[PDB]
Amino acid sequence: PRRIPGTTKVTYTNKKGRTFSFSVPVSELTHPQVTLESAAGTWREMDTSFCELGDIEDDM
Amino acid sequence: ASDRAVINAGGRRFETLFSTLHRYPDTPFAQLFPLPGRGARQHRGREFFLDVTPHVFEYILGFLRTNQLNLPAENLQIRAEVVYSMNQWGLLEHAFPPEVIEDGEGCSTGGAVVKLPDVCVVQVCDHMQHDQGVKRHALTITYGADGFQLRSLIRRVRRDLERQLSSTYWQCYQTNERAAFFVTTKVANGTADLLTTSVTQQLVEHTESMGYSLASSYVTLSPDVVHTSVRMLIHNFTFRRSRRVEVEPGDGIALGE
Amino acid sequence: ASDRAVINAGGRRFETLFSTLHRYPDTPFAQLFPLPGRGARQHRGREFFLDVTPHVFEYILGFLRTNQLNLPAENLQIRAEVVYSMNQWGLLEHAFPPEVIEDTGGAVVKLPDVCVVQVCDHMQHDQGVKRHALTITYGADGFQLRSLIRRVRRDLERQLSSTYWQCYQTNERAAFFVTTKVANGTADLLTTSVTQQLVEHTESMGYSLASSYVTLSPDVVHTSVRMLIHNFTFRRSRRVEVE
């Protein structure tokens, strides 16, 4: 298990031109966003080619 | 001595050396008043006056002898004053310096990136039915936003309930990014008090470890709308995110334009 | 040497510049401090006496030096003294300016320092299905209900489709959110997310949550309308300007 660092640094430039770091509390996701109806295409599918059914067009 | 300077900010006297304020000489802070030139005119010390609060200058001058800046979390007013004073003086870029490293980025061990909000409402609702006169619990934990680690929260709930829950079978798993679930078969009265306490204990321990603090809570108990005998005990907690020790994007309004 | 002025308020000595108290000349706070007149009589510095609290005067003088304000929420007696002292000295209208809305142009509104939000959820049941009629109602005018529904809808496109819920605006201070044909588990996702979007939208206006207290219909017989009345109390402690 890899622990989330929690804080992240982003670069912000002022009106004069001085750059510094905004520290943002940021956590990562854990569960996939499957509730969307759109399908990305990248998910691990289940193999079902070994199963024997009544398909006479296929082989045993 | 000639190295010491008597600086009076807001009516309070401070004494410090010349190398303390000139630790960053290129900044507009130490450039706009001549520390070494006034030491040749006045033999004892240089007398300068500032228009800042003395409690705010303690954080800025205390930073210059330490190279460490810690913004106040409990006092939101002084936190707004340190950010504005170090922005107009050009001194905040050396306290929190920018640094980006492409070679240390590791996306293979990380999921998608979301931002934690400043407030967090958590709803803990279990539905208590009567299975042959004995209570059964179907418990649901719901968060208000994404990012909160539910998989690590569930195993903390799961480890505590292996010693305290006496039933036939029970599960605990994650159903959504913001939702978790728990079912039990015919729990007793005294074991249900161990169930409601241990789940609400490990939940608020998980949110304090995330960097939040409890603002308010709420408990209610009411029957279901459709079914009469189905009870609904809802523990609703509200968590306020603690202020970070460094600067935040929420302090951007206090930066000054 | 001559530009600094000594302020003694409540047994505590304060020293600050001349132009900071005269940053706003039209305010009555600058009129009661004759800074060029007191510097002419006493050539060293001006000596003024006030009966205000020293902790309260640090917020008022801190606003004149740094153009920011954060009112303390942990102490209501200190915070109510700061707002009252800035009202009798005429400093609140420059700290909390009136807002400008473009609907026709008419821009005059004063946001309340204490506002209440009443969130009433109507749970009904007819022919095996159940529905929710959530009614969000703000206290006074000046708030932006157009942007809250934008935050409510955008946080709900990922969770559910537009068929099972509808959210629109009925009044300038009242918002409506209906919910039909949802499961038991996903109903807690909607009520917690709207409550999540309700608080941080008020935080984007410059307020702070004081307390929350909810009631619910404790009847065991069948009722045609069950009511979940969530009440919020917000206190204005800052100002938020986007860009």
Q: Parallel, antiparallel, or unpaired: how do β-strands C12-16 and C5-9 relate?
A: antiparallel
What is the total residue count of chain B? 257
Cβ B160 vs Cβ B198: under 8 Å:
yes
Instruction: Let me know the angle formed at the C-alpha of B17 by B13 and B23, rounded to the nearest 5 degrees.
Output: 120
Tokens read off for C27: 């305010």
* Cβ density class B157-178: b for 16+ within 10 Å, e for less: beebbeeebebeebebebebbb
Q: Do A23 and B111 touch (CB under 8 A)?
A: no
Question: What is the torsional sign of CA B164, B166, B171, B174?
Answer: negative
Query: Three-state DSSP class for C203?
Result: helix
Cβ B186 vs Cβ B167: under 8 Å:
yes
Q: Parallel, antiparallel, or unpaired: how do β-strands A19-28 and B113-115 relate?
A: antiparallel
Strands (E), B144-211: 170-174, 179-184
**What is the H or E stretch that residue C133 is in?**
strand C129-137
A14 DSSP assignment? -
Q: Does C184 touch chain B (CB under 8 A)?
A: yes
Query: Three-state DSSP class for A50?
Result: coil
Query: Distance from A34 to chain C by nearest Cα, in Å?
Result: 10
Question: Which of C28, C78, C16 is closest to C53 using CA atoms?
Answer: C78
What are the chain B neighbours of A28 within 8 Å (beta carbons)?
Answer: 110-114, 147
Q: Do A4 and B114 touch (CB under 8 A)?
A: no
Q: Parallel, antiparallel, or unpaired: how do β-strands C114-126 and B12-16 relate?
A: unpaired
Q: Do B226 and C130 touch (CB under 8 A)?
A: yes
Give the Å distances, CA to CA, from B227 to B231, C129, C222. Answer: 9, 11, 9
Q: Do C62 and B76 touch (CB under 8 A)?
A: no
Cβ B238 vs Cβ B120: under 8 Å:
yes
- Distance CA(B38)–CA(B20), nearest Å, equals 16
Cβ C139 vs Cβ C115: under 8 Å:
yes
What are the chain A neighbours of C160 within 8 Å (beta carbons)?
Answer: 35
Q: Which positions ≥6 away from C209 have C-beta within 8 Å?
A: B119, B215, B216, B238, B240, C199, C202, C203, C232, C233, C234
Q: Do A19 and B93 touch (CB under 8 A)?
A: yes
Helix B189-209 and helix B150-164: axis angle, to 10°? Answer: 150
Tokens read off for C147: 């942007």
B7 DSSP assignment? E
**What is the H or E stretch that residue B190 is in?**
helix B189-209
With 0-12 / 13-18 / 19 or more C-beta atoms within 10 angstroms meaning exposed / middle / buried, residue B145 is: buried
Give the HSE-up count for residue A40: Cα atoms under 13 Å, Cβ half-sphere: 8
| CA torsion, ordered A10, B143, C153, A31, to nearest 10 deg | 70
Q: Do C200 and B119 touch (CB under 8 A)?
A: yes
Question: Which of B136, B127, B181 is closest to B154 using CA atoms?
Answer: B181
Method: cryo-EM
| CA torsion, ordered B101, B102, B108, B113, to nearest 10 deg | 70
Q: What is the resolution of this structure in A?
A: 3.1
| Nearest neighbour of C15 by CB, restricted to B11, B145, B238 | B11
- Distance CA(C24)–CA(C31), nearest Å, equals 10
Q: Which positions ≥6 away from A47 have C-beta within 8 Å?
A: none
Closest alpha carbon within chain B to C13: B11
